[PDB]
Enzyme design. Structure first.
Site, PDB file in Angstrom:
ATOM      1  N   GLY A   1       0.848  -1.327  -0.041  1.00 10.61           N
ATOM      2  CA  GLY A   1      -0.049  -0.154   0.117  1.00 10.61           C
ATOM      3  C   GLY A   1       0.982   1.162  -0.137  1.00 10.61           C
ATOM      4  O   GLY A   1       2.146   1.183   0.141  1.00 10.61           O
TER       5      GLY A   1
ATOM      6  N   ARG B   1     -10.136   2.326  -7.227  1.00  9.62           N
ATOM      7  CA  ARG B   1      -8.843   1.731  -6.499  1.00  9.62           C
ATOM      8  C   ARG B   1      -8.791   1.913  -4.969  1.00  9.62           C
ATOM      9  O   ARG B   1      -8.403   0.780  -4.164  1.00  9.62           O
ATOM     10  CB  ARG B   1      -7.868   2.590  -6.671  1.00  9.62           C
ATOM     11  CG  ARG B   1      -7.898   3.811  -6.608  1.00  9.62           C
ATOM     12  CD  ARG B   1      -7.419   4.895  -7.525  1.00  9.62           C
ATOM     13  NE  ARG B   1      -7.863   6.274  -7.552  1.00  9.62           N
ATOM     14  CZ  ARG B   1      -7.799   7.383  -6.605  1.00  9.62           C
ATOM     15  NH1 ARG B   1      -6.969   6.858  -5.382  1.00  9.62           N
ATOM     16  NH2 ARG B   1      -8.173   8.335  -6.291  1.00  9.62           N
ATOM     17  N   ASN B   2      -9.693   2.866  -4.464  1.00 12.59           N
ATOM     18  CA  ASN B   2      -9.731   2.954  -2.966  1.00 12.59           C
ATOM     19  C   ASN B   2     -11.221   2.049  -2.400  1.00 12.59           C
ATOM     20  O   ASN B   2     -11.565   2.366  -1.509  1.00 12.59           O
ATOM     21  CB  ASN B   2     -10.040   4.413  -2.767  1.00 12.59           C
ATOM     22  CG  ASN B   2      -8.662   5.062  -2.901  1.00 12.59           C
ATOM     23  OD1 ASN B   2      -7.733   4.475  -3.438  1.00 12.59           O
ATOM     24  ND2 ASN B   2      -8.705   6.438  -2.511  1.00 12.59           N
TER      25      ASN B   2
HETATM   26  C1  LIG Z   1      -6.851  -9.727  -6.136  1.00 13.78           C
HETATM   27  C2  LIG Z   1      -6.149 -10.859  -5.729  1.00 13.78           C
HETATM   28  C3  LIG Z   1      -5.293 -11.542  -6.808  1.00 13.78           C
HETATM   29  N1  LIG Z   1      -4.285 -12.438  -6.322  1.00 13.78           N
HETATM   30  C4  LIG Z   1      -3.367 -12.986  -7.554  1.00 13.78           C
HETATM   31  C5  LIG Z   1      -4.268 -13.698  -8.642  1.00 13.78           C
HETATM   32  O1  LIG Z   1      -3.398 -15.055  -8.266  1.00 13.78           O
HETATM   33  C6  LIG Z   1      -2.823 -14.272  -7.396  1.00 13.78           C
HETATM   34  C7  LIG Z   1      -3.438 -11.852  -5.462  1.00 13.78           C
HETATM   35  C8  LIG Z   1      -4.293 -11.139  -4.214  1.00 13.78           C
HETATM   36  N2  LIG Z   1      -5.072 -10.331  -4.632  1.00 13.78           N
HETATM   37  C9  LIG Z   1      -5.929  -9.590  -3.553  1.00 13.78           C
HETATM   38  C10 LIG Z   1      -6.457 -10.386  -2.785  1.00 13.78           C
HETATM   39  C11 LIG Z   1      -7.316  -9.713  -1.781  1.00 13.78           C
HETATM   40  C12 LIG Z   1      -7.042  -8.203  -1.655  1.00 13.78           C
HETATM   41  N3  LIG Z   1      -7.819  -7.705  -0.521  1.00 13.78           N
HETATM   42  C13 LIG Z   1      -7.324  -6.385   0.295  1.00 13.78           C
HETATM   43  C14 LIG Z   1      -6.447  -5.643  -0.357  1.00 13.78           C
HETATM   44  C15 LIG Z   1      -5.656  -4.645   0.415  1.00 13.78           C
HETATM   45  C16 LIG Z   1      -4.689  -3.495  -0.129  1.00 13.78           C
HETATM   46  C17 LIG Z   1      -3.633  -4.204  -0.661  1.00 13.78           C
HETATM   47  C18 LIG Z   1      -2.498  -3.399  -1.175  1.00 13.78           C
HETATM   48  N4  LIG Z   1      -2.791  -1.932  -1.036  1.00 13.78           N
HETATM   49  C19 LIG Z   1      -3.747  -1.289  -0.514  1.00 13.78           C
HETATM   50  N5  LIG Z   1      -3.853   0.016  -0.429  1.00 13.78           N
HETATM   51  C20 LIG Z   1      -4.654   0.793  -1.654  1.00 13.78           C
HETATM   52  C21 LIG Z   1      -5.003   2.147  -1.199  1.00 13.78           C
HETATM   53  N6  LIG Z   1      -4.509   2.997   0.130  1.00 13.78           N
HETATM   54  C22 LIG Z   1      -3.566   2.163   0.827  1.00 13.78           C
HETATM   55  C23 LIG Z   1      -2.984   3.389   1.649  1.00 13.78           C
HETATM   56  C24 LIG Z   1      -3.574   4.597   1.244  1.00 13.78           C
HETATM   57  C25 LIG Z   1      -4.376   4.318   0.048  1.00 13.78           C
HETATM   58  C26 LIG Z   1      -4.823   5.751  -0.516  1.00 13.78           C
HETATM   59  C27 LIG Z   1      -4.601   6.863   0.408  1.00 13.78           C
HETATM   60  C28 LIG Z   1      -4.011   7.832  -0.278  1.00 13.78           C
HETATM   61  C29 LIG Z   1      -5.775   7.096   1.263  1.00 13.78           C
HETATM   62  C30 LIG Z   1      -3.607   6.007   1.417  1.00 13.78           C
HETATM   63  C31 LIG Z   1      -3.227   0.630   0.788  1.00 13.78           C
HETATM   64  O2  LIG Z   1      -3.093   0.334   1.685  1.00 13.78           O
HETATM   65  C32 LIG Z   1      -4.837  -2.351   0.051  1.00 13.78           C
HETATM   66  C33 LIG Z   1      -5.889  -1.282   0.829  1.00 13.78           C
HETATM   67  O3  LIG Z   1      -5.633  -1.207   2.025  1.00 13.78           O
HETATM   68  C34 LIG Z   1      -6.405  -4.282   1.958  1.00 13.78           C
HETATM   69  N7  LIG Z   1      -7.401  -5.362   2.554  1.00 13.78           N
HETATM   70  C35 LIG Z   1      -7.600  -5.258   3.702  1.00 13.78           C
HETATM   71  C36 LIG Z   1      -7.860  -6.526   1.823  1.00 13.78           C
HETATM   72  O4  LIG Z   1      -8.710  -7.090   2.174  1.00 13.78           O
HETATM   73  N8  LIG Z   1      -6.163  -7.692  -2.461  1.00 13.78           N
HETATM   74  C37 LIG Z   1      -5.444  -8.284  -3.396  1.00 13.78           C
END
Ligand SMILES: C[C@H]1CN(C2COC2)CCN1c1ccc(Nc2cc(-c3ccnc(N4CCn5c(cc6c5CC(C)(C)C6)C4=O)c3CO)cn(C)c2=O)nc1
Ligand SMILES: C[C@H]1CN(C2COC2)CCN1c1ccc(Nc2cc(-c3ccnc(N4CCn5c(cc6c5CC(C)(C)C6)C4=O)c3CO)cn(C)c2=O)nc1
Lengths: 438, 438
Positions: A190, A304-305
């Site tokens: 993130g 995205r958010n």
């Molecule tokens: C889709 C599959 C696909 N898979 C592939 C296919 O074979 C492998 C891999 C896994 N992947 C996957 C699955 C589930 C999830 N779920 C979750 C994602 C996130 C997450 C992840 C990365 N970045 C963020 N961001 C992004 C946004 N943002 C962050 C911090 C900040 C922002 C904006 C800001 C400026 C306000 C500050 C920030 O933290 C987030 C959102 O918190 C959080 N939570 C609680 C989840 O449950 N995500 C991804």
């Protein structure tokens, strides 16, 4: 040829040898039909003869054959004979009307229920049971017909009922114990740190968000952590808690299987349909309406958010976390990482964010949801976008968006912030268009 | 102060000592109400503690407490889950809607019955049983409620049912036997002879009309006697027969107790009301419609020429007897005994009587019925009446006549005969205004 038959309106004794004895209730088959007052008929016993035309009732004329229909009865005389009768069901012609008496309550009460005629030759009555209780009506239809395809005695429920997100892993449990956290896999990275899906106590699916060094203001974040913890809604990611005793402080939140709805619409296009993005927008609008009721501003609203769970329901996330960002290129209005695509006029100009700005961002989110994830103003730049927003230009209509939803997301982009809709009326209109689509 | 209570949406096991165990179906009384996600409540067992707000259902929120209402369900998803369920009653929000399945007929059929909300806080459904049979509906309401004041299980009939006038005292019995006639009293005198009420066979109330010497053309009368005998209608005096073997030939007809409706409205004003003259006009119009269907012309239509029976029903009489009058002062258009008051323009001018003239006379009859018997144009004379009818003048509106009935009887007096209404549409309009009055 065809044979005719009638009922015996009254009883007649032949005063003449050329007559036949009519007897009330004994149907007779007319042998010949003419315009004269007497016609020859035959009886079931086998005797035939002439009989008066004023004593016959056509097969379809059974209405008069009954002891209720009274063409002479009016809406007044009928009530005068129903009061003297003192609930008497009496039918009269008028394509008809019915009268019943009321019985306790010595002051006689009469009703004039009119009988309506369907254009398809059927008949009904302009009367509703008027159940003041929905389950009472459901029980009535459950044990009655009421002109329904079937009795309401087959509940349509589902066994896939999962409890909602616990508003925190315990009451007053603001501080999560890293020992309880059961890190499992990684969910990516993130803006402020790295994420990973684990299990609190090994029994609650949680998503830990570990922070990055020099990425967020942990002090202010913990200061307003109780506040952000007081925010709880169905369409809102449920912050379980924060492990502050350990570094990096771990924000344990609700887990969403599908991740960012943006990538869900741009890669996972093999799990939804074009008739569900409206429900996604409804979910987002419900979340926005709640956080507006809480006088809280998402600040950064976009696909995205927003996250999506296994059930396919979308929920907003990172609500109001901007206040704890350290990247100047993202916080500043003129920075490079700043989301000008979703920014609003007053924001980009004087930095006057507000609920109107959140509504603008929600309109942009609806536009991109209907665009399947295409970036707003893919051809323009950060400055040309502001130029066109000032001139009056607005995002076009996605190929899948109806003119109604386009008008909605366009009202979301009103130049005058004070004129922009509220999330409550936006949700009302989204529900209206949803009921219309369905 | 006031106490609050909710139902247990789901079941919760206290993960914290400050929590209370929720159990689906066990109502809990909220001790304090706030905006936080957890609120303290008390249980029937007597234990109290904080519990999640996402697990409570307001008392009026029992809709969600049931296993049918589904706010998320739409008009499409509901049909998709009802087809997989394969009649399932499922309720959804929309102020709501209901869905049921159809079972024979393997091709699943789904209905989307919407629930309507009364302005008085009640609830109903825009659905009619659609009974294609009136007695079937009467039986249904007889054994059901259907939102009625009471079940339709109390017939409102009368025991004062008298058979109708026998179309002649026997079939082919055109010639009455004076021996059978049982002269009783006298009913006055007529234009052609004297009347007297008797009884045929001493068992049938008949009115004998003995003729006067040199008053009618008995030959032509007997010639068309079979014709006039073929005329039979409820609102039409029933000619029983004619004794021609004896002199003066006795026209035995139906007996009417009250006599001429003209004197009935001018002397017997203590037996009817101002809300019944409309029914009298309806009776007269029915008689006129019948005799029009028979291509027969009353020729002389007026309250004087109408009778009334004990039941109060008026019936036309002396239908078309003018052809058998010998008084020149009455037959001629310029005679003294000629009824110019009821005559029509073309009649008074060229002697072109017709159904239009009968309609004019019927309008005059309605006017005098509503006037209680006042003579038309009491101030004018035979010539001034024609003068004013030609200039455009029409009879005024009686004090008891509504503008609607006045417009009716005025249309009856259209200058252009071809434009005058027909008795059928006149009866239709009279029935309409009657149903409106009632
Ligand atoms: C889709 C599959 C696909 N898979 C592939 C296919 O074979 C492998 C891999 C896994 N992947 C996957 C699955 C589930 C999830 N779920 C979750 C994602 C996130 C997450 C992840 C990365 N970045 C963020 N961001 C992004 C946004 N943002 C962050 C911090 C900040 C922002 C904006 C800001 C400026 C306000 C500050 C920030 O933290 C987030 C959102 O918190 C959080 N939570 C609680 C989840 O449950 N995500 C991804
Ligand atoms: C109202 C009470 C009051 N009562 C008082 C109160 O204490 C005593 C006395 C009785 N009286 C009474 C009762 C009943 C009846 N009923 C009947 C009347 C007549 C009747 C009598 C006299 N003249 C006529 N007319 C009058 C019309 N008309 C005749 C011939 C012709 C016309 C017009 C023409 C030009 C076409 C030719 C002609 O014959 C008629 C109608 O046929 C016929 N029939 C069948 C009856 O049943 N009448 C009167």
């Amino acid at each position: 040829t065809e044979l005719k038959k009638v009922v015996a309106l009254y009883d007649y004794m032949p005063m003449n040898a050329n007559d036949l004895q009519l007897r009330k209730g004994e149907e007779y088959f007319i042998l010949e039909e003419s315009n004269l007052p007497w016609w020859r008929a035959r009886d079931k016993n086998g005797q035939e003869g002439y009989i008066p035309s004023n004593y016959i009732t056509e097969a379809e004329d059974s209405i008069e054959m009954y002891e209720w229909y009274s063409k002479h009865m009016t809406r007044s005389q009928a009530e005068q004979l129903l009061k003297q009768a003192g609930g008497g069901f009496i039918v009269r012609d008028s394509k008809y009307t019915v009268s019943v008496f009321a019985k306790g309550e010595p002051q006689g009460v009469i009703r004039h229920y009119v009988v309506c005629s369907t254009p398809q030759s059927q008949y009904y009555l302009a009367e509703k049971h008027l159940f003041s209780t929905i389950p009472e009506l459901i029980n009535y239809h459950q044990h009655n017909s009421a002109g329904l395809i079937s009795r309401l005695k087959y509940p349509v429920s589902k066994q896939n009922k999962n409890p909602p997100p616990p508003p925190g892993f315990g009451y007053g449990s603001w501080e999560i114990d890293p020992k309880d956290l059961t890190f499992l896999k990684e969910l990516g990275t993130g803006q402020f740190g790295v994420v990973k899906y684990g299990k609190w106590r090994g029994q609650y699916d949680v998503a830990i968000r570990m922070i990055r060094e020099g990425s967020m203001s942990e002090d202010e974040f913990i200061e307003e952590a109780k506040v952000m913890m007081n925010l709880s809604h169905e369409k809102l990611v449920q912050l379980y808690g924060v492990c502050t005793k350990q570094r990096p402080i771990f924000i344990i939140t609700e887990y969403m299987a599908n991740g960012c709805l943006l990538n869900y619409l741009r890669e996972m296009r093999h799990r939804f349909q074009t008739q569900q993005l409206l429900e996604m927008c409804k979910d987002v609008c419900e979340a926005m309406e709640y956080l507006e009721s809480k006088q809280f501003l998402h600040r950064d609203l976009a696909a995205r958010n927003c996250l999506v769970n296994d059930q396919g329901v979308v929920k907003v996330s990172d609500f109001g976390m901007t206040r704890y960002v350290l990247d100047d290129e993202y916080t500043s209005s003129t920075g490079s990482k700043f989301p000008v695509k979703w920014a609003s006029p007053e924001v980009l100009m004087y930095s006057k964010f507000s609920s109107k700005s959140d509504i603008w961002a929600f309109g942009v989110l609806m536009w991109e949801i209907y665009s399947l994830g295409k970036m707003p103003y893919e051809r323009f730049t950060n400055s040309e976008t502001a130029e066109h927003i000032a001139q009056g230009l607005r995002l076009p209509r996605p190929h899948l968006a109806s003119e109604r939803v386009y008008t909605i997301m366009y009202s979301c982009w009103h130049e005058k912030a004070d004129e922009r809709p509220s999330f409550k009326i936006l949700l009302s209109n989204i529900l209206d268009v949803m009921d219309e689509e369905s």
